[model samples]
Target chain A: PELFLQDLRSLVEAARILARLARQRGDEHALERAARWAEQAARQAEKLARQARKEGNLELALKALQILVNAAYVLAEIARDRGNEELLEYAARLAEEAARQAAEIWAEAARRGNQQLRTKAAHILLRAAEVLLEIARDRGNQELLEKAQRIVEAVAAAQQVAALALRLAEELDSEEAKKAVRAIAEAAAAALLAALQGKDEVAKLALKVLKEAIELAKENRSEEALKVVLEIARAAAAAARAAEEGKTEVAKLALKVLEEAIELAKENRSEEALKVVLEIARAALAAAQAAEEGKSDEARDALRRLEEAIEEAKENRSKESLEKVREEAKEAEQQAEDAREG
Target chain B: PELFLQDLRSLVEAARILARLARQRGDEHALERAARWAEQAARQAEKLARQARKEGNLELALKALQILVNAAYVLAEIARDRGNEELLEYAARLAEEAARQAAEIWAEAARRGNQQLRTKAAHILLRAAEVLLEIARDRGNQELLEKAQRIVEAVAAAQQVAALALRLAEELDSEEAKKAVRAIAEAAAAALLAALQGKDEVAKLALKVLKEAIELAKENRSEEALKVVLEIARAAAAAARAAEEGKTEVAKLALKVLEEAIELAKENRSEEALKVVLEIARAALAAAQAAEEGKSDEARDALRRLEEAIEEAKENRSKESLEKVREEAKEAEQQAEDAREG
Candidate 1:
């Protein structure tokens, strides 16, 4: 069975008690109990994240970190609702810290792992950026926006560094490493292309690098491309994330840029494209940062683009530039035919 | 310059004229116009697809093919509505061919190109699959289902075979040969897995074999796990691809398996785990396919599990299991602090 489930349950129970106390007696004791429950919940969630991290489950660690952020946010919200500013401020700090930790999971995984880990890290960083963007918008405070921007930038920077490190690791005079790097680079480029959109400076840089990476993969220069694409995704996500956390209007603008990115992804197929799309999703999660943050344009833009890209991918039938494309297109067409009358 | 855009505009105009003719009188003239426009549109779209394919722009190719399909479908629909059974049948045939071509693009991308190409192929495959699935459901015919299944199976088979080929190539005694083989395998796997899911037996088997091949990518095998994880993602995507094609019932079942697979990935912080999660999307897609096909219960169950996994991941607080758990607890405490806001 799930070992963590039991602990989670007990934490929930404690929360329930606090809830009852708050409703019945408006008692400080009840509030304390609720606080304790929140703590337990956070602990359980964090435990799962750490376990996942240790196992090299970067995705899981990210997920666990997300849960901790959620728990912390919830606790803080509860305190604020009860007219406890001090408690609210405290919880907010914890949630932000937890979010940061969660974002780091991907970077760490990529550093110690594979191309997949790098991709995963990119996704986490993007999400962190988006979350911060949302927070900035809600507060309408330049400081918060700056803080959010920094976080996003950090994630982006980390992703770039991870990509570089991955390349270095894969290209350390080992022929085998060189080969592995090339294959991964190809996939990474495709994934990134599929996930990003627009003609912004960041997007252009990413595309240039991704295009180069694709060529590299083609030329068996996988390690270099892999590193470059990772960096591009991280940087773009971070930049967009910062926008997502900026003033309400700026956040909206950031989302538009994100949409353009997704459209670009929809126009192509690559593991890099897909990875970029997935990573960009975290950037869309700006709503999760603060309790009751109003809907921002960037968040909406991100969601819409993702949906459209997914749909387009499922419906498009354009041919590629070679015999292979023709073959694949035909195959896909025939498959569609079979299901047409089912 | 975008020559494709110019041709596309003409095609659009032709389509408009045809639409007007059909609306005016449902006469032979309108039918003729529709047919003419459809042909021109197909040609234009095809030209774009071909060019993109040549340039290794799999995404562009897929887009062109989809436009062609839409135009064909519209013509076919008009023919049917006008009682031009001969024309209707012809349009249907053309549409089928086009859809198959789309699938071919994806397969080729997976089999012959870089990861970006493969991912593009996967996106194309999903659309083709969706169209096929729609056809299957709309017709409610076993023949069609079987036909669609054949194509889906072929896609899966191709991916599996490619994975095997990659393995064989990498396992060879010659280094250069190994590199070439690995590239081929990566391409094949990319194409095969692009439109697939991990939970399917075919994908799982392929993953197992591909992982073996990846293990042979180097002497030290430090990255074997990472490679295995990547395979897991491919498998999941393949399953998802099949599910997307209208195998609703099967897809739903596969998605659950995929979720379990993703969860397994979360237990570690390695590239392997990340790859496994990447494959998990295919399962999710499969569940979505099932849901679309009326297997709501199964789809819902899988979706629930997926969401739960996502939530669990959000709670991670550190890189260590116990520490993360404690961090989660602290986050819970913060939530309690915010209890008042609720």
Candidate 2:
């Protein structure tokens, strides 16, 4: 049977109840039991966070992070005997770490995730944003609340970008809409992270990032031009992914995206980008050549023969064709070994 | 930099305006403009619909269909003034036909689409259901509205199934979740389409289908068997899709899904299904063996050689190894021809 943390949610309530009773009666044994339970719950939430990240499930990852915050808050209370300052401080840091991780996920999702991922990011985003405010209110931390105010604005921006990306996909290219939307989201998230890092230097910098990223996805080009460039951008992404998979696939698929980027770069001929994107073409050719040198002549020849057979197999219809195709496959397999030998 | 159809929606509104003013003012000139414009917009929506279908984008296709509905509605209105009963009938028929097609789409999407696709189906579904109701109301056809009511309840049922499917996916296996969910949705859609064609023979039939399908997905074995069975089901789907692409790929991917299904089937050993799923394994092996027979001894030998070389290449990765691998690839290509021959 599939496992759910469905019943585990009540653990938080149990931890809180035990901790309160322990505090009222000044009972060390009850306090110890509650503390251990909250720690166990914290570990469970962390494991969920780790598992979700490993599975590449951003939505679940955010949920786990939120669960982590709850556990952390409970532990913080358990630590507060009006005596254990160090434990309370550590627990507060634990809560803040979960909040920080949640925001990074929102930004990360914005940068590279697809529509569903981004949508999930926004949902987890706003709730975690709420968690930060809630955590701050309880602590009576004014400066922390100010940080919460800044984050909520960024969360709202991220939400808007998520909606806009889906809207664009409804009318335009799915790959392009998400990519462009992703680029915009990432830039927006970067702004939030920048704010998170910087003490108070946010609102204006965040706006600057949001405005420029949109223009970048859609250059000065009209809707039509954006499509062409978006195609080039998608191609660029595919090429990058291929490079990660293998040099052969990269050697084969690399140039199409890079060349398209340059072609648009020249036509639009924006002076700043002209100097930049000419290197876009330069980068692809260099990688293509690097991969080209890695394979031997025999392997290259076999690839060509296999390519020919693939095309040749398409042309004729007679039964004799089967025998002819067998010879082509035989030769290609031989070449594969010969290349390995050398 | 983002564009929306805040204006294009008015295209539908403007067409209705032209149709209404043309009908009252006795203007064929305006009628033709509205007529040609509606037709052009029909073509536009059709292109959008066609493009969406070609791209495997069901959401936009539904939007295009709803757009198609509005254009049809205006044409029907434009035809009904005076001296044109023939045209009125043609336009009414057109409207009815769009309504029918819209429901079929809802059913089609319900059968095989994923979460977003099914969600989009419900949205377009309910709107189109209303369009049928509105169309019947305008035509003074009481029987049509009765058909509308039956279709509406089926639409609601389909909508509930869609939500339930998504809910399952969230707390369960994504791949297994979607497959089980897909099977449930398809069965639900079939019930609706059954109603669409059979007139009033729907409500109880739809309910029966919905209840049985959920049981089929779950079985008596509880959640774990469903997962194991669902894994088998996903494998079964993958194998079927592979068979469509190439015999060789099917030869590789077929057994995994089929085997899992039978394993779960026997473990539960429900008498009726036990008989059914045992043959599921039989069907897969028959296809695999049929493919096995279609290749020659020599081609099979080369395939074995290539497999060996692939494994060898995975071993000691010295620079000296590249040439040894070339022979394996060349031999495999030769065998591809031999397989094609005999």
Candidate 3:
């Protein structure tokens, strides 16, 4: 099973690289070939998923379904880029099937107490939602939108189960277990951020992942973690809307949320969250402030709020959070100072 | 000039992607086409450099030369993979010319105090060295090795000038300037580590980059920074030798270096450097420690020493470093604990 998955991963990775190369070269012929490769990979993954289900290996089936959905997503992207509506529609249907299989696995995993499978199912569903959303945008299909929405809800549920599993594991006080759980959450968070500048459908998928991360962090009861999640959500929303509507003022709102999150984290002794919020807030502020869409006043106000927040965090000696706040404050102050110099 | 350089960068980038795809697919016809694309890109860059030089735009010329070197590097890699000795030789020659142009620019920039050009020149020289090293390994040419070594030395000198320029800019307390300098150093460090598992000649190129990064850090006069440098050097050497001898025991020595660097960074009050060092060290340690070729008692002894070092650092004052140490210790300890769990 491991070897088969490994082989499939390599092929899919190769297909992705080829697709990227084709796009860079503007070689329509190569793009067509790459699209075919992606389609074939998706079909192979679907076949693997069916076999796994026949063997009653729910975990393997979930893995295969994830690969199938990811491959289909790639196919859909290539199809869209090449303006092949028929291919896009076919890829969407394949993705929909993969999502269905994932939900089935999620149900089985929950009934059997399979924590790892549930986590995998959550990721698969999120990917499926992304594909379905892409189809919704292309065809304005009400049915597709409903399917995507349902998948996202299922993803939320699966993530909740996974978070519960982590909570149970945390009682053992095993640092490794805790770290593993943290890594999983971080990976989801990273994937979410990677899609921030993507299309609306892609960004929507990221929002779901962010929600799941928030759920996991909340389960861990880390105040800082929750604050970081809120800041990420805020930044993502503002960035996506700013990209779509060219509203620089809306982008400034993201910085405001970040500043508020930073302050709240500092007050609540969520030093870790404070650090994350400050880092992300600084970047979002820089981007928003640099936008040429004419919202300089709002941008300046956002920056001023951030400055005040940093000062307040620095002065607040909540002892445990003080050190982290100081570190983050220094970073924020340095960035602001740099902005002035520039 | 900026637009010209941007165009050249994109072309070289495309060429690189094509070469990688060709290598992955093992299609000789595709490899040949990719090689032609790289050669063409390098030729165009050379032409741009010559025109810029004639127009007295040395900075632009330097930029073109950098692109030329990068393109040639890709060509050489493709040629090497395809076992085309003649093509490899030609690419190496082209790279040498690019390196020479870069050195001329570096000298001109130094006399004029043009820090930006010097920084670009440093990167260009490093890349040229990598290409030259590839050629040296292919033919075991003593002259090629000496040439590569000389280029690396020049790279260090150029980077020093760039660092000096950054220091002058630092007075403005511009976070951007500091961040830019830190990024350059970090990029060099990452590139060096990435070559650790490659050929001996490739590792030597990395060693040069590491040396330059160490020099930059030492300029800040942080004792812990220097210690980390020494440890990284030691580990890199051990790892290189271990790769040659197929000894996992010696490879594990790199993990010791990471552990030591993490501890030293925690002690020096260099919070920024500490964070960067911890992140990279954790990744490097995980990779080295995961080698399954049979471990020796020496590896175990190194781990014991690291444990003692962590304990000793914990006992030290400076609560700021202590918190970071505890965080990183939890991570490192958790990884070790995870290994046991597995």
Regions of candidate 3 where Cα sits further than 4 Å from its true position: A1-342, B1-10, B17-30, B134-139, B161-342
lDDT of 2 at A43: 70
lDDT of 2 by residue, A1-342 (tens): 013564567887799899988877878788988887787777777777777777777756766755566676576567656457676666767666666666656655655664455445544444444443334334455555555544544544445545545555565566645566565455445444444543223323333323433445444544433543443333233222223324434333343323333333434444434333322333332333334446524334444554555454345423455335445445544554555444
Model 1 ranges with Cα > 4 A deviation:
A1-342, B9-17, B20-25, B44-63, B83-85, B99-113, B132-137, B149-208, B211-342
Listed per model, the TM-scores of chain A against the true chain A are: 0.41, 0.56, 0.45
Clash statistics: count for each candidate? 151, 58, 0
Instruction: Kindly give the stretch of ten consecutive residues in candidate 3 chain A with the minimal lDDT sum.
Output: A189-198
- Computed on alpha carbons, the lDDT of every model, listed in order, comes to 0.45, 0.50, 0.52
> What is the C-alpha DockQ of each candidate?
0.01, 0.01, 0.01
DockQ of 3: 0.01
lDDT of 1 by residue, B1-342 (tens): 457565675675677566657656756676677667676567656666767767866656666765565565456445545666676557657656666556556555434544334333433333454443433333344544444443444343443444334444435445444444445344344334323333345443434433433343343233433344344434444443444455534544454444444333435534533433443443443344344455555454544544444455445423463244334334433332333122
Local error of candidate 1 at B182, Å? 5.6
Candidate closest to the true structure, highest lDDT: 3
Cα deviation of A235, candidate 3, in Å = 22
